[PDB]
Amino acid sequence: STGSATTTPIDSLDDAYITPVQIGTPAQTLNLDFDTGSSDLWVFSSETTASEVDGQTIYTPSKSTTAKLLSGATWSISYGDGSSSSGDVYTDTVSVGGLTVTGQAVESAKKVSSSFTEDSTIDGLLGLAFSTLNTVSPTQQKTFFDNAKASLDSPVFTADLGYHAPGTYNFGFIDTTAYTGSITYTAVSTKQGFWEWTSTGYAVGSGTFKSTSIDGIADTGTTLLYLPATVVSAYWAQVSGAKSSSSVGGYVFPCSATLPSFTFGVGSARIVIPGDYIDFGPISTGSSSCFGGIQSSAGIGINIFGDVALKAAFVVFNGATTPTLGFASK
């Protein structure tokens, strides 16, 4: 089997992407944030504290003839940005782009943190990291991909995120029309539960390539590109007037600037992030200070190849017995 679904930016900055997901019988369609950096599929629901729902579409298990309470199971998750959610668990039928999993754990939120409430466009998350990170207790549950894998034509999914435009998540096949040149594959460590890999280096603008190993995670649920302070300083040094602002919480730059591109290495291959992808707009409405899309990972504890990086590529998440990651230009 295969599936194919369009993923759409939630706003004009590409802060996140939502993908429609059918849950239950009859189908309830919710728009979920596909997140290769976590491993829980959770949704706003009829069980979510009423004051914490503000415009989201909710899953109502009592209206699904295939929903079953997973007795005794609870979940609770905290994300890198400080947000969190928790609740109980149902199993139900879940379909993405025509690909159906029966008996998928659907984690129903009883509580969500303010950032989730305040974002009316995201109805929940669909985790695509390794199932070892799943938070369901006392019996850990499998991701949608893990459950689908054996049925797929090939045990892969692909992320093709758009810049200020829709893109695609495919399951079970590689669309050879969706990228240019060849896909370069690189090793993955699953030791931390992430799609963790090592970039071979970087360049800033038309500058020379610096060969250096950068361990990090391919994370569709993180907006920006977080890299070591040395790398980030070298990038922003090429933008007149750019500076790191402790009050804003990262590098900012004059909105009048033209940003240089940033290249990262995948083996001997190179992925080029155009400068415009690194512009996240005014820090506050009407400001002429703009927020940068490349930020320091110092104090995160890990480098993160988030959407800024991934949207410059066609990315293969290869879930074979030994997983690997592939990147192509597009």
Coordinates of C-alpha atoms in Angstrom, one line a residue:
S1 CA 0.0 0.0 0.0
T2 CA 0.9 3.7 -0.2
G3 CA -0.5 7.0 0.9
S4 CA 0.0 10.6 -0.3
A5 CA -1.2 13.7 1.4
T6 CA -0.7 17.4 0.9
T7 CA 0.8 19.4 3.7
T8 CA 0.0 23.1 4.0
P9 CA 1.8 26.0 5.9
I10 CA -0.3 27.3 8.7
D11 CA 0.6 30.9 8.1
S12 CA 2.6 33.2 5.8
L13 CA 5.9 32.4 7.6
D14 CA 5.7 28.6 7.3
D15 CA 5.7 28.4 11.1
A16 CA 4.4 24.8 10.8
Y17 CA 2.6 22.6 8.3
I18 CA -0.7 20.8 8.7
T19 CA -1.8 17.6 7.0
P20 CA -5.4 16.3 6.9
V21 CA -5.9 13.0 8.8
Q22 CA -9.0 10.9 8.9
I23 CA -9.8 9.4 12.3
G24 CA -12.7 7.0 13.2
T25 CA -15.8 5.8 11.5
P26 CA -17.4 7.8 10.0
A27 CA -14.2 9.7 9.3
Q28 CA -13.4 12.8 11.4
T29 CA -10.9 14.9 9.6
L30 CA -8.4 16.7 11.7
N31 CA -5.4 18.8 10.5
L32 CA -2.3 17.5 12.3
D33 CA 1.3 18.7 12.5
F34 CA 3.4 15.8 11.3
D35 CA 6.4 15.7 13.6
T36 CA 9.5 13.6 12.8
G37 CA 10.9 14.8 16.2
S38 CA 8.3 13.1 18.4
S39 CA 6.3 9.8 18.5
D40 CA 2.8 10.5 19.8
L41 CA -0.3 10.9 17.7
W42 CA -2.5 13.2 19.9
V43 CA -5.6 15.3 19.1
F44 CA -7.8 17.9 20.5
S45 CA -10.9 16.1 21.5
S46 CA -14.3 16.1 23.2
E47 CA -12.3 15.4 26.4
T48 CA -10.2 18.5 26.2
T49 CA -10.7 21.1 28.9
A50 CA -13.2 23.5 27.3
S51 CA -11.3 26.7 28.2
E52 CA -8.3 25.2 26.4
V53 CA -10.0 24.8 23.1
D54 CA -10.2 27.9 20.8
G55 CA -11.2 27.1 17.3
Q56 CA -9.6 23.6 16.8
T57 CA -11.5 20.8 15.3
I58 CA -12.0 18.0 17.9
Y59 CA -12.0 14.3 17.7
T60 CA -15.1 12.8 19.5
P61 CA -14.5 9.1 20.1
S62 CA -18.2 8.5 21.2
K63 CA -19.2 9.3 17.6
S64 CA -16.8 6.7 16.1
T65 CA -18.1 3.2 15.8
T66 CA -14.5 1.9 15.7
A67 CA -13.1 3.8 18.7
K68 CA -12.2 1.8 21.7
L69 CA -10.8 3.1 25.0
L70 CA -7.4 1.7 25.7
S71 CA -8.0 0.8 29.3
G72 CA -5.7 2.4 31.9
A73 CA -3.5 4.1 29.3
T74 CA -2.5 7.7 29.8
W75 CA 0.0 10.0 28.1
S76 CA 1.9 13.2 28.8
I77 CA 4.4 15.0 26.6
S78 CA 6.6 18.1 26.8
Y79 CA 8.2 19.5 23.7
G80 CA 11.4 21.4 23.2
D81 CA 9.6 24.7 22.9
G82 CA 8.2 24.3 26.4
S83 CA 4.7 23.3 25.3
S84 CA 2.9 20.2 26.6
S85 CA -0.3 18.1 26.5
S86 CA -1.7 15.0 28.2
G87 CA -4.7 12.8 28.4
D88 CA -6.0 9.2 27.8
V89 CA -5.9 6.9 24.8
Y90 CA -8.2 5.3 22.3
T91 CA -7.5 2.9 19.5
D92 CA -9.2 3.8 16.2
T93 CA -8.9 3.7 12.4
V94 CA -6.5 6.4 11.1
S95 CA -6.0 7.2 7.4
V96 CA -3.5 9.5 5.8
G97 CA -3.7 10.2 2.1
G98 CA -5.5 6.9 1.4
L99 CA -3.3 4.8 3.6
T100 CA -5.2 3.2 6.5
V101 CA -4.1 1.8 9.8
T102 CA -6.5 0.0 12.1
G103 CA -6.0 -0.1 15.8
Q104 CA -3.8 3.1 15.9
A105 CA -3.3 4.7 19.3
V106 CA -5.1 8.0 19.2
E107 CA -4.1 10.0 22.2
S108 CA -6.9 12.2 23.3
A109 CA -5.9 15.5 25.0
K110 CA -7.5 16.3 28.4
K111 CA -5.1 19.2 28.8
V112 CA -3.0 21.3 26.4
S113 CA -0.7 24.2 27.1
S114 CA -1.4 27.7 26.1
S115 CA 0.7 27.6 22.9
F116 CA -1.6 24.8 21.5
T117 CA -4.8 26.6 22.6
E118 CA -3.6 29.8 20.9
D119 CA -3.0 28.1 17.6
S120 CA -6.4 27.5 16.1
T121 CA -4.9 25.9 12.9
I122 CA -3.3 22.8 14.5
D123 CA -5.7 20.1 15.7
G124 CA -3.0 17.8 17.1
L125 CA 0.3 16.1 16.3
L126 CA 1.2 13.0 14.4
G127 CA 4.6 11.8 15.5
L128 CA 7.0 10.2 13.1
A129 CA 10.1 9.7 15.2
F130 CA 10.9 6.2 16.6
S131 CA 8.3 4.5 18.7
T132 CA 10.7 4.2 21.6
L133 CA 9.9 7.9 22.4
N134 CA 6.1 7.3 22.6
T135 CA 4.8 8.5 26.0
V136 CA 1.8 6.2 26.5
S137 CA 1.9 4.4 29.9
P138 CA 1.9 1.7 31.1
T139 CA 2.0 0.1 27.6
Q140 CA 4.0 2.2 25.0
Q141 CA 2.3 2.5 21.7
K142 CA 3.5 2.5 18.1
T143 CA 3.6 5.4 15.6
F144 CA 1.4 5.5 12.6
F145 CA 4.4 4.8 10.4
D146 CA 5.5 1.9 12.6
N147 CA 2.0 0.4 12.4
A148 CA 1.8 0.9 8.6
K149 CA 5.3 -0.2 7.7
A150 CA 4.8 -3.9 7.0
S151 CA 1.9 -3.1 4.6
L152 CA 3.8 -0.4 2.7
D153 CA 5.2 -1.1 -0.7
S154 CA 8.6 0.1 0.7
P155 CA 9.2 0.9 4.4
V156 CA 9.7 4.7 3.8
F157 CA 8.0 8.0 4.1
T158 CA 9.1 11.2 2.4
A159 CA 8.8 14.9 3.4
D160 CA 8.6 17.5 0.6
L161 CA 7.8 20.7 2.4
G162 CA 7.1 23.9 0.4
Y163 CA 8.5 27.4 0.8
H164 CA 5.4 29.6 1.2
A165 CA 3.5 26.9 -0.6
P166 CA 1.9 23.4 -0.1
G167 CA 4.0 20.3 -0.2
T168 CA 3.6 16.5 0.3
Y169 CA 4.0 13.6 2.7
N170 CA 4.2 10.3 0.9
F171 CA 4.2 6.9 2.6
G172 CA 5.5 3.7 1.0
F173 CA 7.1 5.1 -2.2
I174 CA 9.6 7.5 -3.5
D175 CA 8.2 9.9 -6.1
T176 CA 11.0 10.2 -8.6
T177 CA 9.4 13.2 -10.2
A178 CA 9.6 15.2 -7.0
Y179 CA 13.3 16.0 -6.9
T180 CA 16.3 16.8 -9.1
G181 CA 19.5 14.8 -9.4
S182 CA 20.1 11.9 -7.1
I183 CA 19.1 11.2 -3.5
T184 CA 22.1 11.0 -1.2
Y185 CA 21.6 8.6 1.8
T186 CA 23.3 9.0 5.1
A187 CA 23.5 7.0 8.3
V188 CA 21.0 7.4 11.1
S189 CA 21.5 6.7 14.9
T190 CA 18.2 5.8 16.6
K191 CA 19.9 5.8 20.1
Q192 CA 18.0 9.0 21.2
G193 CA 14.8 8.0 19.3
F194 CA 15.3 10.6 16.6
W195 CA 16.2 10.6 13.0
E196 CA 19.7 11.6 14.0
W197 CA 22.4 12.0 11.4
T198 CA 25.7 13.8 10.8
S199 CA 26.0 16.6 8.3
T200 CA 29.4 16.9 6.6
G201 CA 29.7 20.7 6.8
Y202 CA 28.4 24.0 5.6
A203 CA 28.9 27.2 3.6
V204 CA 27.6 30.7 3.9
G205 CA 26.5 32.3 0.7
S206 CA 29.0 31.9 -2.0
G207 CA 31.8 31.2 0.5
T208 CA 33.9 28.2 0.7
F209 CA 32.6 25.0 2.2
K210 CA 33.8 24.1 5.7
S211 CA 34.1 20.4 6.2
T212 CA 33.0 19.6 9.7
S213 CA 30.8 17.0 11.3
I214 CA 27.5 18.4 12.6
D215 CA 25.3 15.8 14.5
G216 CA 21.6 16.7 14.5
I217 CA 18.1 15.6 14.0
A218 CA 15.8 15.8 11.0
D219 CA 12.7 17.4 12.6
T220 CA 9.7 18.5 10.7
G221 CA 8.0 19.7 13.9
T222 CA 10.6 22.4 14.5
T223 CA 10.3 25.6 12.5
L224 CA 13.9 26.8 12.4
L225 CA 17.5 25.5 11.8
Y226 CA 19.4 25.2 15.1
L227 CA 23.2 24.8 14.7
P228 CA 26.3 25.3 16.8
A229 CA 27.1 28.8 17.9
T230 CA 30.2 29.0 15.8
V231 CA 28.3 28.1 12.6
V232 CA 25.5 30.5 13.4
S233 CA 27.9 33.4 14.2
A234 CA 29.6 32.8 10.8
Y235 CA 26.3 33.0 9.0
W236 CA 25.0 36.2 10.7
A237 CA 28.4 37.9 10.4
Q238 CA 27.6 38.1 6.7
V239 CA 24.4 40.2 7.3
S240 CA 25.1 43.9 8.0
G241 CA 23.4 44.9 11.3
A242 CA 22.6 41.4 12.4
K243 CA 23.0 40.7 16.1
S244 CA 22.0 38.2 18.8
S245 CA 19.4 39.7 21.0
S246 CA 18.9 38.2 24.5
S247 CA 15.6 40.2 24.9
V248 CA 14.1 38.8 21.6
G249 CA 15.6 35.4 22.1
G250 CA 18.0 35.0 19.2
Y251 CA 19.5 36.5 16.1
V252 CA 17.7 39.4 14.5
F253 CA 18.5 41.4 11.4
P254 CA 17.4 44.5 9.6
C255 CA 14.3 43.7 7.6
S256 CA 15.9 45.7 4.7
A257 CA 18.7 43.1 4.4
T258 CA 19.1 40.6 1.6
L259 CA 20.1 37.4 3.3
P260 CA 22.8 35.0 2.0
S261 CA 22.0 31.4 1.3
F262 CA 23.2 28.6 3.7
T263 CA 24.5 25.3 2.4
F264 CA 24.7 22.1 4.4
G265 CA 26.5 18.9 3.5
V266 CA 24.9 15.4 3.1
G267 CA 27.9 13.2 2.4
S268 CA 29.5 14.6 -0.7
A269 CA 26.2 16.3 -1.7
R270 CA 25.1 19.8 -0.9
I271 CA 21.7 21.2 0.0
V272 CA 21.3 25.0 -0.6
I273 CA 18.8 26.9 1.6
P274 CA 18.0 30.2 -0.2
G275 CA 18.4 33.4 1.8
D276 CA 14.7 34.1 1.7
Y277 CA 14.0 30.9 3.6
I278 CA 15.9 32.3 6.5
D279 CA 13.6 35.4 6.9
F280 CA 11.0 35.0 9.6
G281 CA 9.7 38.6 9.4
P282 CA 9.3 41.4 11.9
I283 CA 9.8 40.5 15.6
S284 CA 6.6 42.3 16.3
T285 CA 4.0 43.8 14.0
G286 CA 5.4 46.9 12.3
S287 CA 9.0 46.4 13.5
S288 CA 11.9 46.8 11.1
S289 CA 13.9 44.2 13.1
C290 CA 13.3 40.7 11.6
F291 CA 13.8 37.3 13.2
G292 CA 16.4 34.9 11.8
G293 CA 15.7 31.4 10.6
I294 CA 19.1 30.1 11.7
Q295 CA 19.6 30.1 15.4
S296 CA 22.1 28.7 18.0
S297 CA 21.5 25.3 19.4
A298 CA 23.7 26.1 22.4
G299 CA 21.7 25.1 25.5
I300 CA 19.2 23.0 23.5
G301 CA 21.6 20.1 23.8
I302 CA 21.1 19.0 20.2
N303 CA 21.3 20.5 16.7
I304 CA 18.0 20.5 14.8
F305 CA 17.5 20.5 11.1
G306 CA 14.0 21.9 11.2
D307 CA 11.7 23.1 8.5
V308 CA 14.1 25.9 7.3
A309 CA 16.5 23.2 6.3
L310 CA 14.2 20.4 5.3
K311 CA 12.0 22.5 3.0
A312 CA 15.1 23.1 0.8
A313 CA 15.2 19.3 0.1
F314 CA 13.2 16.2 -0.8
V315 CA 13.8 14.1 2.3
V316 CA 13.5 10.3 2.6
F317 CA 12.9 8.7 6.0
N318 CA 14.0 5.2 5.3
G319 CA 12.6 2.8 8.0
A320 CA 14.3 -0.3 6.8
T321 CA 15.8 -2.6 9.4
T322 CA 18.8 -0.3 9.5
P323 CA 17.2 3.2 9.1
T324 CA 18.8 5.8 6.9
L325 CA 18.0 9.4 5.7
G326 CA 18.1 10.6 2.1
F327 CA 18.3 14.1 0.8
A328 CA 17.9 15.4 -2.7
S329 CA 17.7 18.9 -4.2
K330 CA 14.4 19.9 -5.8

